[model samples]
Target: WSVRPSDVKPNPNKTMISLSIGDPTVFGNLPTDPEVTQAMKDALDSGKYNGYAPSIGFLSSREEIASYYHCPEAPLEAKDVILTSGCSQAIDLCLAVLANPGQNILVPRPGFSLYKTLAESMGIEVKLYNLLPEKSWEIDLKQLEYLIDEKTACLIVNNPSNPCGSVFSKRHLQKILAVAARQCVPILADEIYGDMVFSDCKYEPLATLSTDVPILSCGGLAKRWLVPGWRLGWILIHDRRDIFGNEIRDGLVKLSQRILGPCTIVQGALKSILCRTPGEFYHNTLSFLKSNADLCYGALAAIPGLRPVRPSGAMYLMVGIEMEHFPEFENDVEFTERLVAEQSVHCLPATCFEYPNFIRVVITVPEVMMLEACSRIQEFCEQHYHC
Candidate 1:
C-alpha cells in the first residue's frame, strides 16, 4: 500500500471533537463574500471551471496573490507564484526542488509533522533544531548553528507558528534573517497563519529581508480565508538574488502541471474572495479566536502537571503532557489514546508533531465547547495524575 490509514492518528467517529488537526469549524461556516459566491455561481452557470484550469493556478488568482503580500516587502508578480492544492503540496514541491538524496534540511522540533515525514520519506536528511519551549518556543540559535553546515538545504519557520502561536517579534525575525544571511541559505517561511492574528502583533515574513537572504514563501487561503475545502494555495518565490531562478521556477511550474491542478471554480472564486471580503469579516473571525484562546488558555492553566504556552498569533497550541507523571503510559501516543478513550476529549499527542511526550490542540469551536472539552480533560487528569 502506498499510503495507509494507520499512518495518521485515528479520527474516531464518536463524540469526535478533534482539537488535534488545527481545523476550525468557523472556517467551514463563515459566509463567503456574496459577490465572490455569486461570481463563482455565474462562472459555474456558464460551465467555465467545469474543465481543467491552468495547472499553475488561474491567472487572476496568481495576480491578486502577488499584490496581497506587497506590504513588508514588494508583493510578487503572478509569474513568481505557483499554485498548489494546499500548503502541504507547496511544502512537497519546496523539498523536492531543493533537496537531493542524503542532503540535509533544518526543521524545528515540537513542529508540524508533514515536513519531517515528507523529508525522511523522500530520503533526505531530517535535522532537528530545538525550539525552546522555555523561550516561548523560539529557535535555539546555538544548536541550529551547530547542526547547519554546507550540506544544509534550507530552514523551515512557521511564523505565527503552529503548536505554539508565538509570532516572532521584529527582533526575533531579524535574528533569523541574520542567521540565514550568514549561512547564505534560503528560508521556507510557512506563513499559512499569516492573517487572523488575535494578538496585537505584527507578522513580518522572513522573505522581507530578501535584500540580504533568499526566501521561498509558502502560504494559502485555507487558514485565513476560512476555506480549507477550497484547497487553493500557492508558493511565491520571494527571490532576491534570483535564488528561485529560472531553473527552480520552471521546476515548480512543471511540478504543478504534472500533478493535474487545483480546482477551477475555486481559482476563479479567489478574485472576489480576496478583494471583496469586508473588514468586519476578518475582524469578527479574529474576535472569535480571541475568545477561544482565552477559554483554552485559562482552562489549560488549571490542569496540574501540564504546561501550556500562550500564543500571540495562530490558532493552535501545544501542551506538555508530563509523561513522568503517568507511569501507566510509555509515550505521547499512549497518553493521547488514553485521553481520547477515557475523557472523550481530543487533542493531538506531541508525538504526532514528532515530539515524544507533548500534546497539541486546535481551537476551532466556541468558548462553551472548549470549556466543556477542558473540564472533561480535567476529569481525565484526576484519574490519571499519579498513575
Candidate 2:
C-alpha cells in the first residue's frame, strides 16, 4: 500500500552486506554431528526415503524438534510438527489456515517483513503491536492487551529477534501469555536463532510457556545450523486444547501433503542437526561474533547519521539512519541510495524491509573488512550528507 516494488531496485555497484535478509554472515563452524551425516549416508547408501517421505513430517525428526524446543510443557509429539521448505512456508501456512480474509493479525514493529507481506497478500490485515525499542525491544504489554481483540488471529513473537536481537524473558513470556489467555489468541514464535544467542541472553520458546493458549513454534535448520540452503524447517503446533495440536496439526500435514514434502536428503539427516551441534562450536561462534558485533557497532558509532544498536545475538542489528542530520536525501532510502551510488558500500534501503526512513546495515565480513566498510560508509555519508 506504500512503496512500489518498481522503486525497490538493488544497487548494482554496491557490495552487498544485508542485515535485513536475516541470513547468517557465514557458516559458523560445520557441525560434525556424525549422526546427522550418517543418517544422510544411510538413507543414500540404502537408497531409502527416496520416495515421498510423507508430507506431514517424519516421527524421528519431529520428536527431536519437540525435545529441543523444550516443548514438554506444551506436551509436544510427532503429531505436533509439520515440516516445510523453511519457516517462510510455515508462516504462510499458519496465516493461511488460521485467519479468514479481512481479519487482523498483530505483529511487532520493525518485525519480520515476510509475516506482514504474507498476511497482507492473503487479504489479512496487519496491526503493529509495538516492541518498545526503549525497553530493550520487549513488546509493550499494556498496549498489546489494549490493541488485541476478537479480530486478531495471532501475535507474531520473534524471540532472539531478527534486527533487534532482543531475547524475551520468561516473565515477559508469561505476561504475553496472560494477554493471550484473555483475548483467546495464539502466539506465532519464530525462534530459529535460539542457539546463536549471545551471552546473558537466552531464548524461551513461547510455545513452552503454557498449554492454555495455542502456540505455533516455527523453526528450522536454516539459521542455527547455518544451512538455510538446506531448506529444512518445521511448524510445531503447541496447542494442548483438544487432542493437542490436532486439528491445526493435521491441517498442516494435509497442506504439506498437498504440496509434497521438504527435501529427501535433508530430512533424512535430521538427527545430525537436532543432536550433533557441539557446545564448543557454539562457544567459538558466539565468542567470535560477539567481538565482531562490538567492532561493527563501535565502527558505525564513529560515523555520523547512523545509530547502530549493540546486538546480543543473531547476525544483524538495527541502526537508526539519521536523515535529519543527513538531510540532502530527504529520507533514509535516498540517503542509502546516494551512499550506494557514490560509495561501493551496499545496505538495505529503509523502505525495502517494511521500515520507512531507516536504513539497516550488516557486518558479514571479518573485523578489518567491516572496519574498512564502516570508514568508507562514513566517508561517503559525510561527503554527501545534507548536500
Model 2 poorest ten-residue lDDT run = 25-34
Please give the range of 10 consecutive residues that has the lowest summed lDDT in model 1: 6-15
- Alpha-carbon error at 361 in model 1, in Å? 0.9
**In model 1, which residue pairs have backbone atoms overlapping below 3 Å?**
70-75, 350-358
Candidate 2: tens digits of C-alpha lDDT, residues 308-363: 77777777767777767775667766766666566656667646656666666554
TM for candidate 1 is: 0.90
For TM-score, the strongest prediction is 1
How far off is residue 85 in model 1, in Å?
A: 1.5
RMSD, one per candidate, in order: 3.6, 4.5
Across residues 74-120, which tens digit of lDDT does each residue of candidate 1 receive? 45888988888888889888888888888888998878878888898
TM-score of every prediction relative to native: 0.90, 0.88
Candidate 2 regions exceeding 4 Å error are 1-22, 25-39, 241-245, 384-387
